[PDB]
Every structure is written in structure tokens, then in C-alpha cells.
Amino acid sequence: AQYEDGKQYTTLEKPVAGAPQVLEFFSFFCPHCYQFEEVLHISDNVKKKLPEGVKMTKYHVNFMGGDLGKDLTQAWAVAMALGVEDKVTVPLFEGVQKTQTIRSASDIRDVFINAGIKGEEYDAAWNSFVVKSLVAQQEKAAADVQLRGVPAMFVNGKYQLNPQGMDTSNMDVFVQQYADTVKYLSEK
Numbered sequence: 001a002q003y004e005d006g007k008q009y010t011t012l013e014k015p016v017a018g019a020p021q022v023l024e025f026f027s028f029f030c031p032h033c034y035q036f037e038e039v040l041h042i043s044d045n046v047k048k049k050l051p052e053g054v055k056m057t058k059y060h061v062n063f064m065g066g067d068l069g070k071d072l073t074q075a076w077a078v079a080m081a082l083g084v085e086d087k088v089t090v091p092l093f094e095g096v097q098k099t100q101t102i103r104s105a106s107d108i109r110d111v112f113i114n115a116g117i118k119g120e121e122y123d124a125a126w127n128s129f130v131v132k133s134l135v136a137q138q139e140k141a142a143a144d145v146q147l148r149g150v151p152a153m154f155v156n157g158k159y160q161l162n163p164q165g166m167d168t169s170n171m172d173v174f175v176q177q178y179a180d181t182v183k184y185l186s187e188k
């Protein structure tokens with residue numbers, strides 16, 4: 001077969017019922033997640049190859065970066081609650097991994113302020129039980145797959161992308177192989 005279990009993807013032995021159709025996990029501490037966002041734009045190219053009848057979900061993980069890792073998962077919840085993912089994703093990556101100016105929750109907050117979210121607005125969201133449940137949603141989804149590594153993408157709670165099984169001599173070719181695989185899996 002052109003697409004094969006163990007090549008472009010693997011099959012979960014305990015599939016997750018009711019999961020999001022297309023679910024990616026990332027960490028702002030994760031070097032490959034940095035590439036996936038700024039250099040490869042994986043999420044955008046996957047969306048361009050799915051129909052407008054499929055929802056895409058992106059969740060942060062706790063297991064990288066200790067205390068600041070958990071702050072960033074809550075900050076991602078704030079970003080999702082306020083709908084400002086596209087405004088804060090790049091400054092958070094660059095602040096953690098490029099300039100290394102994100103060292104505390106206050107520094108994360110500064111990113112949002114500089115991106116234009118009001119201080120009262122950030123703080124009220126940060127402390128809300130709506131954000132508390134968005135944090136719980138991110139944890140529950142990663143725990144359903146005993147997630148131990150990022151970047152990760154899962155399709156219909158049944159299949160996990162296997163980027164190590166694709167060709168990386170060319171960055172655009174890799175991105176389109178990856179996105180075509182998500183499409184094939186979504187249609188499965």
C-alpha cells in the first residue's frame with residue numbers, strides 16, 4: 001500500500017472514543033514544534049487540505065519545562081478562551097526559545113499585553129473557571145493517549161502521525177506529505 005501502518009502513521013491499540021477529529025499537541029519548549037509553527041506552518045497546511053467540515057484542535061502539554069510548562073498550558077487556555085492564538089503563538093515560541101525572555105508567568109503575560117490583550121482581560125481569563133476547564137480539557141486529551149512526546153497529531157482518536165517516516169530533504173515536500181497523510185487518515 002502507498003500509506004501503511006508504521007510508515008506515515010501508527011495505529012493506537014486503545015483508540016479514544018469521541019476525540020477531536022484532528023488533534024495536535026505541542027509545547028512552546030519543544031524545538032521541533034518551533035519548526036512546525038514558524039518554518040513549516042504544519043497546522044495551516046493541514047487545514048488547507050481538509051474539507052471545511054472538519055474541526056482542528058491544538059493543545060499545549062505540561063511535560064516540558066516544569067513549572068513554566070504548566071503556566072504555558074494555562075496561558076494557551078487563556079489564548080483559546082479569548083480567541084487570540086494567532087496573535088500570541090509566535091511571540092511565545094520566540095520568547096521561550098529564541099530570545100529566552102520568558103522566564104515566569106509575568107513574562108508570558110507581557111506577551112499578551114504586547115499583543116494587545118488588556119491587562120484586566122488577561123487576568124480575569126487567567127483566573128476563570130472557564131479557563132480552568134480548558135486546562136482540564138488539554139490534560140485529559142493528552143492523557144487519553146499517554147502522550148510522551150510532541151509535536152504529535154492524532155486523527156479521529158485512532159491514528160497518530162509518524163513524521164519520522166517521511167522524507168525531509170525538502171521542507172515543502174515533507175509538509176505536503178504530512179498534510180496529505182492527515183487527509184488520507186481523515187477519509188479512512
Ligand SMILES: Cc1nc(CCN(C)C(=O)Cc2ccc(Oc3ccc(C#N)c(C)c3)cc2)no1
Binds near residue numbers: 036040
Ligand atoms: C513516534 C513519535 N514520537 C513523536 C514525538 C517525539 N519528539 C520529541 C519528536 O521530536 C518527533 C519528531 C517530529 C517531527 C520530525 O520531523 C521533522 C522535524 C523538523 C523539521 C524541520 N524543520 C522537518 C522538516 C521534519 C521528526 C521527529 N512523534 O511520533
